[PDB]
């Protein structure tokens, strides 16, 4: 027996994962975005209230790359989480929140202040998302490549503690690919019908412009909300169509390999050939891309090499024996093997280099939350939580005295 009534919250750049300690998978996974309406945050929360079109409702994100951008919207996200998805008043359940290693210490302090003062939870703890991702795989010596929508980062962890200065940050992330497919849409002129108006499916054969109708009842929607929903559509496109070349992108090979088919919400459908292989090469080599191609842009293999190099050789061999890839962008088809070859070239194979296997959507996205679930139920860890009576001074002094 090592378990307590612990809830593990893992708020990344795209979705918030809330679940109980010991659970194999997060209980709920609903997006970071949240709705707004005129009077404070008159509201709409998850994938069910954030999608129905509404009279001039606008959608924002209280998060940005993992750092909190609006603590009131964050508080209301948490309130709805507790109210419905976990449907347990928070006054009893110990909680541990995951924060990106590069998130500010002052923001950690303010997060603790909000948590304890308002929600009056009886215990608390903090542990970084990369730390938790390496926590899931059971490996002390690990190197993590986290890549969500808004940011891609590489972080090593040894003895379970991040090399706090050994952080590499690269905007070449899910949003990078999403912008690339956006400019693809524009260049070959996809008209992105949002699914929420379509009411007919007069589909058409390949390439033809499909016919359809828009529902008369629809009210006006702020541009931000429409932008968010079409962004989700193109995210589905990212998941479905994008594929990554095993080796450096080549035009003749990219044309030779069989094309693939994607259909859009309104019935418009199109086939993609070399462009889908070309696009992730932009992540693996920013130079070929439009605009976002300056030498300042750093690709995945260069990112891992930089993160590995900045730390000395007393732990670099440990990083060699395990490369761990997490986050969304690692799910682009054949991304992991491409990264593996890329590092095998960049990093001298002269010494023992291994990857660590993890594939499915549960294992990449929620590996940050799975590590938190592993910690929360850990027997020795039960002593570490910041108690309320401790919090009285801990939220200021021991939120750092305790949680490195």
């Amino acid at each position: 027996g090592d378990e307590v009534g612990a809830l593990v919250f893992d708020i990344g750049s795209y979705t918030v994962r809330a679940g109980y300690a010991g659970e194999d998978c997060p209980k709920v996974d609903f997006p970071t975005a949240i709705g707004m309406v005129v009077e404070g945050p008159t509201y709409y929360i998850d994938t069910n209230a954030l999608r129905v079109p509404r009279e001039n409702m606008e959608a924002i994100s209280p998060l940005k790359n993992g750092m909190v951008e609006d603590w009131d919207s964050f508080q209301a996200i948490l309130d709805h989480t507790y109210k419905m998805h976990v449907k347990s008043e928070a006054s009893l359940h110990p909680v541990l929140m995951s924060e990106a290693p590069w998130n500010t210490r002052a923001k950690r302090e303010k997060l603790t202040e909000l948590m304890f003062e308002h929600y009056n939870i009886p215990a608390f703890f903090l542990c970084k998302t990369a730390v938790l991702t390496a926590f899931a795989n059971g490996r002390s010596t690990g190197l993590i490549l986290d890549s969500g929508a808004t940011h891609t980062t590489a972080i090593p962890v040894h003895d379970g503690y991040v090399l706090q200065q050994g952080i590499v940050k690269s905007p070449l992330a899910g949003d990078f690919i999403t912008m690339q497919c956006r400019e693809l849409f524009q260049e070959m002129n996809i008209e992105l019908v949002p699914p929420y108006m379509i009411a007919s499916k007069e589909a058409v054969r390949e390439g033809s412009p499909a016919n359809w109708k828009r529902k008369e009842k629809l009210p006006q929607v702020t541009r931000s909300w429409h932008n968010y929903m079409c962004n989700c559509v193109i995210q589905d496109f990212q998941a479905s169509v994008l594929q990554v070349s095993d080796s450096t992108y080549d035009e003749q090979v990219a044309a030779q390999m069989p094309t693939v088919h994607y259909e859009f919400p309104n019935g418009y459908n199109c086939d993609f050939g070399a462009e889908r292989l070309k696009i992730p090469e932009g992540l693996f080599d920013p130079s070929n891309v439009k605009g976002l191609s300056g030498n300042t842009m750093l690709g995945v293999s260069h990112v891992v090499t930089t993160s590995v190099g900045m730390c000395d050789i007393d732990i670099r061999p440990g990083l060699y024996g395990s490369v761990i890839v997490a986050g969304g962008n690692t799910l682009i088809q054949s991304f992991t093997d491409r990264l593996n070859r890329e590092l095998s070239q960049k990093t001298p194979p002269s010494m023992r280099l291994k990857l660590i296997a993890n594939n499915t959507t549960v294992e990449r996205r929620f590996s940050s939350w799975i590590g938190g679930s592993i910690l929360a139920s850990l027997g020795t860890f039960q002593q570490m939580w910041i108690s309320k009576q401790e919090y009285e001074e801990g939220g200021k002094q021991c939120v750092e005295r305790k949680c490195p």
Binding site: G1, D2, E3, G22, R352, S377
Partner: protein, 48 residues
């Protein structure tokens, strides 16, 4: 081999399902329950 010290799978034979399961090692999960892990060894066919 590389001599990893933790992956000590071994041939084992159960009693009730009396057969050689192959490479399996024993572990204690949550709640004090002794579990046998397993490998899908390329020797799998030899155990007929």
């Amino acid at each position: 081999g590389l001599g990893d010290v933790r992956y000590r799978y071994c041939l084992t034979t159960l009693t009730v399902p009396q057969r050689c399961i192959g490479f399996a090692r024993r572990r204690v999960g949550r709640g004090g329950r002794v579990l046998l892990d397993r490998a899908h060894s390329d020797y799998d066919s030899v155990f007929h």
